[PDB]
Structure 1
């Protein structure tokens, strides 16, 4: 009689997985987006008799850090990272997070920032001259040229801080900025250290890694699974309703 509960739980988790897939498909064009992997997880109920009821609860692993594809925009301050590079920026709460959205912008007061959040380098957030043109090197050097001044006065005015996370130990926070897991940050320190083995490319921008074939296959599988679970639900309901009349005289 309780198989209806297992079937409805499976249906609800299928709906959750469908919602995850729809979320991945919707923002398929945001720059520097990481897809949200998902896979059903089994939980067996047991004890003292005939362990048969095994429930299903959907779960989502961290992400797939497969690099997104690069498109050339020729904008001087667009950065594309290596296989597993990250740019570290302070978040709203004041803590640091990691991202790959290379669409840097400069405010009216010489404040560099990715969308919403300022970029950090040596020390606090990096600041450039008031209206200087900015060029980004292949290793993170920010060269500034004051307008009108002759070209022979290009000066380095700071440096980006680049970290290296392999991917299995980073988890997406509530605002889309990745952070190290508990054990990873315990064993590598609260704040990561800059490394030179990471190179950027100026002028190109990174998209998102969403697989249309994977999305379509998951949608088809979820549709079929949900329909099967619904059929099991209605069969069990009809069986119980027909059998309920035994108590009569």
Structure 2
């Protein structure tokens, strides 16, 4: 054939990949502490002899969007929201250290703090709270525990949440949705991120997802139009080859 069909076909398939990324972003429009994935087409030119005429296209995801999200006021002392460019630290699935923005902190029957089922990490490691005690979280992450039955004079600090500062260019979303330091950024900032004392959190507010609707809509419209354009090129190339095959007769 004329491999021009293999260019428009790639452009049509990567458009479906982009649509699958955008639809995934739209599905998580209500996920607490969600970071939308950025999608971008990139052109790769095929090198060779003689005339460079073919340039294929692939969909890539250049990190995520770190724009602080919406803040819903839920009058719950455990749901916390972070200052812009600030991350909470939890223990990842494989016993590693991961970063998140979901402040929906839950207390188990044994007293351990968890986020989405992952243990919460402080300066002393995972945080264990006295069993069945009221928890208040300060602006700088200090945790006060009140034991029921005892007077409010008993309120004393227990542990401090680990709050780190990381930009978009330094973190990469792992396969389980937890952000981790990229290789270059890890090599310069060390393996574990030191807690930043300047990070402030707000207790009683939960951060929503930063999925922008207007950009999503425009992206879907553009993707549909591009897919139709590639289909019209594919049809034209197929029609051309069908007659060109007549040259072999007689």
> TM-score category by the smaller chain?
over 0.9
- 1:48 Cα offset (Å): 2.6
Q: Deviations over 1:208-248 (max 9, x none)?
A: 00111000100000000000100100110011001101111
- 1:117 Cα offset (Å): 0.2
Q: Which runs of 5+ in 2 are unaligned?
A: none
Corresponding residue of 2:217? 216
CA contact (8 A) 2:124 2:159 kept: no
- 1:9 Cα offset (Å): 0.5
Distance 1:63 1:244 in 2: 48
CA contact (8 A) 1:46 1:52 kept: no
- 1:35 Cα offset (Å): 0.2
- 1:192 Cα offset (Å): 0.7
CA contact (8 A) 1:170 1:181 kept: yes
Alignment RMSD (CA, Å): 0.6
Distance 2:56 2:103 in 1: 42
Distance 1:120 1:210 in 2: 27
Q: Which runs of 5+ in 1 are unaligned?
A: none
TM-score (norm 2): 0.98
Runs (4+) of structure 1 moved beyond 2 Å? Answer: none
CA contact (8 A) 1:136 1:142 kept: yes
> How do 1:69-88 and structure 2 match up within 5 A?
69-88=70-89
Distance 1:166 1:43 in 2: 28
> How do 1:1-16 and structure 2 match up within 5 A?
1-16=2-17
Corresponding residue of 2:50? 49
- 1:30 Cα offset (Å): 0.6
